[PDB]
Please model this.
Amino acid sequence: DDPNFFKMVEGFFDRGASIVEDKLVEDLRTRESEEQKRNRVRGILRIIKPCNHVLSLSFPIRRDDGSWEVIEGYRAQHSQHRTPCKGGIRYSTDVSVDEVKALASLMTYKCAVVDVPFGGAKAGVKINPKNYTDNELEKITRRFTMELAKKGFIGPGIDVPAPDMSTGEREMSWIADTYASTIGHYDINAHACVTGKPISQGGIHGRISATGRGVFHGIENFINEASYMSILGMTPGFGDKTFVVQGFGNVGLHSMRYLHRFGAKCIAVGESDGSIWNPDGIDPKELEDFKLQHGSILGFPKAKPYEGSILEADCDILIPAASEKQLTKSNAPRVKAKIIAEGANGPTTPEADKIFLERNIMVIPDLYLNAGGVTVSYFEWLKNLNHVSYGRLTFKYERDSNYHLLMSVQESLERKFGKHGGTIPIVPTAEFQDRISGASEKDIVHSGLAYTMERSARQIMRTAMKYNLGLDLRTAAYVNAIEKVFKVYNEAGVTF
Amino acid sequence: DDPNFFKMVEGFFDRGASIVEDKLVEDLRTRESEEQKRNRVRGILRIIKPCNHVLSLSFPIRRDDGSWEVIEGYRAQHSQHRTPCKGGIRYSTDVSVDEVKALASLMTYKCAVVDVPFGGAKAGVKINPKNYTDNELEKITRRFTMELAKKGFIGPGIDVPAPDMSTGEREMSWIADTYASTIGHYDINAHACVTGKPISQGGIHGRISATGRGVFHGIENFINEASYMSILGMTPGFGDKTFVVQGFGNVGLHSMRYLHRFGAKCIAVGESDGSIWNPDGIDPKELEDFKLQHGSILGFPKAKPYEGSILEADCDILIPAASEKQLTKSNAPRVKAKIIAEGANGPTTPEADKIFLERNIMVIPDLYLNAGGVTVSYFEWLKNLNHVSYGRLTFKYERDSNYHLLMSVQESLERKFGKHGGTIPIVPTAEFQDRISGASEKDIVHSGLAYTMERSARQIMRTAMKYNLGLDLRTAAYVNAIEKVFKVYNEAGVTF
Amino acid sequence: DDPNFFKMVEGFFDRGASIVEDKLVEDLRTRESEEQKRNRVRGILRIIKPCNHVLSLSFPIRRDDGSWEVIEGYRAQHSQHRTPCKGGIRYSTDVSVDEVKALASLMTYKCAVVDVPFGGAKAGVKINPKNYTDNELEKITRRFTMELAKKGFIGPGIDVPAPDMSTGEREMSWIADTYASTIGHYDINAHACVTGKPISQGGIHGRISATGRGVFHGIENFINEASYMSILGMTPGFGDKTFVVQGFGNVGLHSMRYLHRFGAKCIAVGESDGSIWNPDGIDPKELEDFKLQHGSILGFPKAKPYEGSILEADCDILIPAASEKQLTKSNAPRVKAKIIAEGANGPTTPEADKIFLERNIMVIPDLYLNAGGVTVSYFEWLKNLNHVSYGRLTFKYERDSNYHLLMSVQESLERKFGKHGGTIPIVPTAEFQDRISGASEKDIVHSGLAYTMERSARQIMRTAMKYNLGLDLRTAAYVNAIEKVFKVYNEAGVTF
Model:
């Protein structure tokens, strides 16, 4: 089947654009003919679809052994409506112009869903990182940054790179240092050229768990909605809920940790090399400790190895958080999970979606679910522009206000009841006291992430209801994104 | 009589400058002779008065019919003390250099009254907008922006245009797009080049009702001040208060809506083509619905047409919110309203002010009253610089703090009274619950607007008290503004 | 066969790079092993080959009928060694990334041959210009310029566009005006953003005949070289020389005009729709006048239509100045011309070159021959940077020096011979007098063009002699270009 960076993304836009065409024509305030309005709506939808800027590079590096190599790189920007763009850099041998174009378009709609004011971008360097030493990878990253900077593709007001799976926070420091040295110069905002930096460099707390927390909040919003749970025939809330996590990466680990924290039970954990199964439940902390020392999850005590395919395991909800095309037309009928939460990008095929829709299996789209990382990278970009950590000037002030409020209640009650009843001490609870003492930037970031996922989930539900979609949340997510990008471009003031 | 853009504004400064001259000399910490001090005070007051930069343009456009036209435009900046400047663009056939100069000076003092750190500016394009199509008006606006940008007159750190009566949010999009395309380039702050943009483009919620809310808060501050109400012989508060709104535009509609929301009664509504009168009261919602479909307010049921002049109607307070020179020396003696709230700009003549002062009629100045729009445009400018909507990172965090505070009260009370009394559930009230659920950026903007109008009203009262002025709030408003602009320039560090 | 923008250009580099590899290793001053030197030479040759920057665009325009269209454009820059780049813009439906990449590489070596300090560039807009009105083509050109400018692809110090066949001087004015309006701003050198402008805008005199003059000077250098003419068995000089021009475009017309001016005879003129033949000769002026009014050359008096193929006509030299692949393996054996002068780009196939080399037919490469246009565009770029026409400050000064020199000769002779012989008036000849009176910028430009073509021809001859090439001037031209680009990059100070 076609991969995620393939006509799937283009097909998603095409299906979404056709759906929104009728409504946009009707709700158009401009005075013109119906044919004139329909051409205008279809005309703008054609402008939105392609990536307006794509840069192809070829720059040399000299390897440690002394040989000479020419490295190809790409950077596709999808910004007809908003600047700056935001997108990761992928170091892989199979990157291509078509791939970065598709992923740049995908990031545009992902940012629109969570109301992040960024365009889409994506970079690719056609190397295999395992065949280069750390000294060589630094030279590749620095040289790639220089070529991007000279052509106006990496600036804080232009295009903000982000970490991908193949690039860590070490590479982001190389990008940030290179940008400031050459073209950032003495710009005050040059620190915000890149996101995913270490904490000491202006990075944000809670970035590691960002994608995992977003997955949890995405599920939580749809698990507490009575209308959807009635369709699935399940009780609202996480009470007596069992989930299976396919893949134990960064997303899978943190998603399980926050789900177990709220009463959910992990009855099985999948992996490429094996599977784990326990009806009683799997402790996220114990499994994490086992994985980091043994190098894998097989042989983990308190749970026998699973028999069969982890995807077909009986569970209330399922979390495919690794690889692509895990759910296909072949295995879709045997899936016993009422809810599928796409932690990874494109774990289900378009054919599989049709079977799930028939079987009344809610599939929370990857476009919305794993957007927690994009949201937090937006917060880090804001933090570097603010040049101050969140809450630094307000934590002490809010603490004093909270104690003044409690003293107001205490004094008011004491004079109401007089000497009778003695003194009524009003003190913060243990949970509140820990919140007051341990107040830090990560509390603000997690609060903002939870607010974004909650608000976007409500918008997707309204979009699904308006267009008479049922459990097809994927189309609703794309339709919701298409409308936002359409409105921004339509009112952008560009020449028509 | 002289219009608002006429020697009235110059006369207001001249009267205010003479009043403040004596006090400024005495409260001057510099060591010099009395003659040296008085020359310095008068010397700076001469620097403040004129507009330091005025640009006259003449640029061509080609009309749709193919003919050629040369359009004249102006942009006066009044910034000897602060940058950036802020001011609207007026499309009118009768604009002139003198008019934009006077309005640029007026905006400087209006910004100073509400503590908005902007200089004054004003633009004028000598065209009649009704004689041009939308395609032509876009070309005029874009070309006017390009000429302004090349001469350093439209930048976000230089001069921020604002919407006027003759220009809507559509024009602001044209200005913003033109600036970013040509000279804004990839500046991160290029979004803040203009205010009044649509919401999708970075506009701010609550801009439409901003001027109306400011009028309400301006009246409210002076209606609850016991000292002033004692002079007028009226009880404080809006209880049993009747008001008449002359003009039913954007300012008149929203001013009536918020006044009626707080117990005031609208007994009459004026208009150019007719008048409405009802001692029982007029519902703002019903009248608004009637106006938007019938195109006017005449023939509105539940109220007979008024007989005579709407300005002389018997009411507690009066709101002239349309046109100029409505209150003159001729009709001033017959006015039966104890309070006049200048919603529009210059609705009273200087001669009329003298009669009102004799009759003990408080006239809340237009310089302060209709400054709500300027304040909110300041907030929108800050929002575009912040690159995030207000409260996005704090709404969820504050909600959790509020619930922790209530749980602290509940647990403290429960352990105080033990099992006796059972559980004491502490939950937010219905009004608070709506505030928590419906929390949005417009709540922050309305809060900031109310704080600004409250603080400025207190400053004007102190200025009126210090200079022994009575009900002459107009002079107090100008005197208050003159002192602030004097202090900023005196301490600006410019060469003396 | 493969077109000119195809693996032909890549094949030319590959053959040339292999030839120069041996010599470059030997003449390397760095101290290292032979294997280390050979890797360094081969390593740099790999860096030179690809285009380092390629930009793909997709921007919208609205057609006059109101419909919406998305236009694709490309701009390939080939600059690892020199900046700025220089290259034309082609409006064609069949443009592609591979095509602009090949032509950008070709321009790099063409500039190197004539010692023009520019890198290679090429742009393509995938439209058919005949399907758009002049209003639409202006919007396409202006919008294409804006996108190029924002990404650093059109600046005077970055990349200077030039006119192609499909774009005239009208488009260059659109590009220049758009650049100055948006990003050129008030840069003093913003006038030099583009070349091929009209004279009033800073264009250079003699641009129209530049390519034709270069073809003449290219032939003249190789027609007066005794060594080459001995191989061909022809007398040096243009005396009793007959030439055939295939194609009567701008290049064909001017090439014939200057050849006939120096004694050569045009016995035949080819064309797509017909052919003209006259052993007596064809007057360039009469044929030009006939063409501009009848729209073609068929039916031209004083010459019967030619029978057969114009390429096989018996002539001393042949000038293919139209289309591509005119000389193939099929017709190569029947060609009766001793010299082939490639006025157009790629009129001979690589297979045809082998037959010509066997038959001792000298083929003057198109890489060098039609480089007159590139040289003059370099002069125009210098003129815009100088902000003064050539010779404006020197024509009068040199005229006075010339007359002083003649007066010195006259007075010296008069006193030598005394009264005997009377006066010896030393006056300029008629040819010199016309040169003095009609002195203008075009004289300087034509002088510089002739000097460049002469010097480059000598360099190509030395390169052909050094590498033991015979009449294979095409490989010598590429080998000469490869060495120059190699040396510039090797000594550029880039990291190795």
Summary: The first helix of chain B runs from residue 4 to 26.
